[PDB]
């Protein structure tokens, strides 16, 4: 009975982290019922249905095409539809050639053509372009050519089979797409947008928490978590952003998201944020070591380091708010100029020769932190310019 | 005609990068010809084939089940095989309750049961445990229960549709696995064990090259290429190493890979190697920056910083050979002990007070690299103890 407890608790947490999952679990059932209902109560023209498997194929298309996002279902349905169309054409042509050839060489020719085409398509499925965008199209191309060839039917029977398969794929796909767009849309573009903004926010949190924690049993573990987990999640999220970018490319335009929305720039800014995460990770690893410098030697540089960290955090926070609000912002300029000024002041403080009296190992550690922080500052400057460019060339509301 | 070139030249570089991609495009063609033979030349017992679509379903399973690796086909073909066996049972029992109830309620009770279980199964597909292993198993559990329900057939006609679907998944599913295993096996287990051992070698190049590029237009770029584009493949390959580990659990025990081969330790080590790529990434930026320290000030630490960097790379080089050769190796202990020795002799060089005379704006970047290098040496000591542990719990030949 205990595993029943564990599975129901896992269900509870998965549902509570996200409700759109439950609403999608209901949307799939609604699509199935709508499609199935369509066949039982023939709406306007009782379709011929020569083979007796139209309903089977409609339900199969609906179960396979319907995915979480809107870009996912639109892409899967469009690949499946276009591949079925072209491959049905090619299959009818191959069957006509097979018939025209002769009597006994017909199975030989059909099997040879299936071989050649499946081989060429399986090879093409390895290209990078195809692998990222139209993969599921080519699996269906092979499926359909092999269906219309290797299934033993006669000529007119083959023409009817191809038409039936195409019409059923179109109906299943359109039903899936309409219910996914019009009931409770999960746009992948907005999921990518929110993920980018959330990443910005976690980085700001760490920068402020560092400015505080650097110069100072259970609460130790909680603060260790509140430091580690956030940037450590930014680090391990390359594939999620890369996938949401494709899905978002597939989508139609909707509110505040115009026709040419640059998702590749979103992924570029994500890459810059990942570099910041590398540096922040080095900083954190130097926080959680045992060999820590005595406090006052850090406090002798406590002023500019605290100023630098705080201003970087505030600049990142303003960029996150400017992305959540979908408006061009110009506070990041002030918040990054302050950090450049703090870098210059730290430079002229180091020039004055204050660290001349400390043992050089403490110098190792202290200049390590100073170097990582200066690199973080330069990186936030670059990120500020890049986000400004994205917001310009994605047509944000110039109101500010 | 020019775009006909950019497609054929892209074909060649995909074929030469990996030849096994072509021998796979011929293995898919061979499973179709073999299956389509089994259903044309009935070997021993002419199957009943009540509906006329056994040959369609056998060729539809082969196109979907057959994937590159062996763990991918043994995995897709085992989800699809079991999900059809169970759902075929639930698909019949759900069709007995429909009849037992009444006449007009029959098309009402069957649609509800498709709704309830396609809504629960869609939800389970979000769980983190299910999503990695048995995902395609649950997409099929929804097709099958919605094949045997939402397709209009009578009572006795269903006990055949459930068997005709199951017996055409076992045959189309086995015929895919016997070819993947016996013709030219692409074991995903070895594609991971090779990638891990190829990563160690990419890092060893940078460390051997570091001591030379540090202390010293086109060869600018190629040597920039042989640094940047080399280690940067370790950072961007978190998903490939994680995918090949999922397959590698499905596979059978081929030669030198016992039954309990720890594919989760292979990813734990790869997780440490990604931490070295973080630090190595920081060393690279201070190499490609404009503000470079004048040489002779760098040169006063050239004795240990060249000994630390080199003996670390000669330690990662043995771990890469101790994995290609699949033998427990104790050479890495000699190569890692020297690096810890070079760390202490750097302290007694730093404690002796030699860097007291350089302007502190330069001590930033100089004590930076000393810090990133000392952390790398500290990491390869942890990697060495982990690979040494992997070789035990994978039962490597103790010959050495």
Curated annotation (Swiss-Prot), chains A, B:
Phosphorylated. A reversible phosphorylation is required for activation. Expressed in roots, but not in shoots. Detected in the root apex in absence of aluminum stress and in root apices, the stele and endodermis of the elongating zone of primary and lateral roots after aluminum stress. Not expressed in cortical and epidermal cells. The modification Phosphothreonine is found at residue 380. Malate transporter critical for aluminum tolerance. The STOP1 transcription factor is required for ALMT1 expression. One of its GO terms (biological process) is monoatomic ion transmembrane transport. GO terms for molecular function: malate transmembrane transporter activity. Induction: Up-regulated by aluminum. Small induction by erbium (Er) and low pH stress, but no induction by cadmium, copper, lanthanum or sodium. Changing residue 252 to S: In strain: cv. Landsberg erecta. It is found in: Cell membrane. The modification Phosphoserine is found at residues 315, 322. Essential factor for aluminum (Al) tolerance but does not represent the major Al tolerance QTL also found on chromosome 1. Acts in parallel but independently of MATE, an aluminum-activated root citrate transporter. Disruption phenotype: No visible phenotype when grown under normal conditions. Lack of aluminum-activated malate release and shorter roots when submitted to aluminum stress. Keywords: Cell membrane, Ion channel, Ion transport, Membrane, Phosphoprotein, Transmembrane, Transmembrane helix, Transport. The lineage of its organism: Eukaryota, Viridiplantae, Streptophyta, Embryophyta, Tracheophyta. It comes from Arabidopsis thaliana (Mouse-ear cress). The chain crosses the membrane at residues 28-48, 51-71, 104-124, 133-153, 169-189. Changing residue 36 to A: In strain: cv. Bay-0, cv. Landsberg erecta. Belongs to the aromatic acid exporter (TC 2.A.85) family. One of its GO terms (cellular component) is plasma membrane. The keyword Phosphoprotein applies. Activated by external aluminum. The chain holds residues 1 to 405 of 493 of the full protein. It is a multi-pass membrane protein. This is Aluminum-activated malate transporter 1.
